[PDB]
């Protein structure tokens, strides 16, 4: 393990580096590396993790769709046989979309997860371990896909059921989980009305609580309420 | 979807 | 040569998946293994190979450019000891860059330049050229600064000397080639009257050529002469 | 600077 030479506090300056200079590969691998050193991540660090990793699969995720896109057409009416290269190249993509993948899920199995005691770090991390099974599911095309689905599911609702216990329903990281939930529901599950239901009620939920809040956590909370309405207002 | 709070 | 089981023409093929995917590290190597087929590159191949490399390499001067700035922050007044990591990072990205500038400079070496006979491919290559050791004095500090200042140069007056005697002065070719060795006297050189007499040559020259043209031809040259010009009212 | 002419 090639980070494994590196201090630990300068990992994690490196990888604030990093973002600085939209290096998120190598913010990726800095993270990587401070997660194998065995300790707990603060939320400042546990920001990193997230931002790195979502940065590099984004990319990778927005070019599957573009060659997934491309290899449909092929498949098209009046469609010229063009060779194997597009399935090819996807395969391609889609597999070092499938190591991120399961390089995330590896840090939060080994030992993230286990570790997080508290709720903001319990929470925060099954909630990637929904978001990176996700990913996989956008993907998936076996028998498995049932399986990848459901451990979406799953991690998603563990992380339902303490964020409902024990967060404010404003918490934003509460507030993530719900639309990326929902997500879930309504372009993995084909369940769109659970998808509505649950973005819904967490705004309404929300929405009650905001008179709790400073001006800077009103802020916070709003913008993720203003990305649930942006759904609601897509799917209805 | 969302995913770096503050 | 890890492109060497591929077919030439499946590697230009995934070459322009990889652009339109915006994956432009595959769509390097794609093109790199190319090239290293052996054989000429046409006129399209030779624009996919300089998209991709352009791409790959902007991006690592952006990161060196914000880690530098960084870094000189670091040397400033009142500025508070951070260990050696930012020098430490931008050496890392600074290395990759240079890695990257060696291989497009290794590929014109052996041989697109000496298989180069007609005057678009010869000026295209050594334009390159120019580039590329432009990008590696962008960086420079030691001795050799001045040996690879003096490469480029050299590089971009002899493409300026075959597009003079071999080109009319709206090529596109020709005018991005004027564009770029007036931005190497303006930034590397310390030559920003050199600079500036080139792109007003040059614009002054294409402009008198434009009747010559047809509708699609005036667009391709209008579009680098008003760079030309963007560099001069930048510049005076 | 400038480098893929149509
Ligand atoms: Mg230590
Ligand atoms: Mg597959
Ligand atoms: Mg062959
Ligand atoms: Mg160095």
Redesign the interface.
């Given at each position: 393990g090639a980070m494994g030479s590196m201090e630990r506090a300068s990992l994690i300056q490196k990888a604030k580096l990093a973002e600085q200079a939209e290096r998120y590969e190598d913010m990726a691998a800095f993270m990587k590396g401070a997660v194998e050193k065995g300790e707990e991540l603060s939320c400042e660090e546990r920001n990193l993790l997230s931002v790195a990793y979502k940065n590099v699969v984004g990319g990778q995720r927005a070019a599957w769709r573009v060659l997934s896109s491309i290899e449909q057409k092929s498949n098209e009416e009046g469609s010229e046989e063009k060779g194997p290269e597009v399935r090819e190249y996807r395969e391609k993509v889609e597999t070092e979309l499938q190591g991120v993948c399961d390089t995330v899920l590896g840090l939060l199995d080994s030992h993230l997860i286990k570790e997080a005691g508290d709720a903001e770090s319990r929470v925060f991390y099954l909630k990637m371990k929904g978001d990176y099974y996700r990913y996989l599911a956008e993907v998936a095309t076996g028998d498995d896909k049932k399986r990848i689905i459901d451990s979406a599911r799953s991690a998603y609702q563990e992380a339902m059921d303490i964020s409902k216990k024990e967060m404010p329903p404003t918490n934003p990281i509460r507030l993530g989980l719900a639309l990326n939930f929902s997500v879930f529901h309504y372009e993995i599950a084909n369940s769109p009305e659970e998808a509505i239901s649950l973005a819904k009620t967490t705004f309404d939920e929300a929405m009650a609580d905001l008179h709790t809040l400073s001006e800077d956590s009103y802020k916070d909370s709003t913008l993720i309420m203003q990305l649930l309405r942006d759904n609601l207002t897509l799917w209805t | 979807?969302?995913x770096x709070?503050?």
């Open positions: - | 979807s969302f709070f503050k």
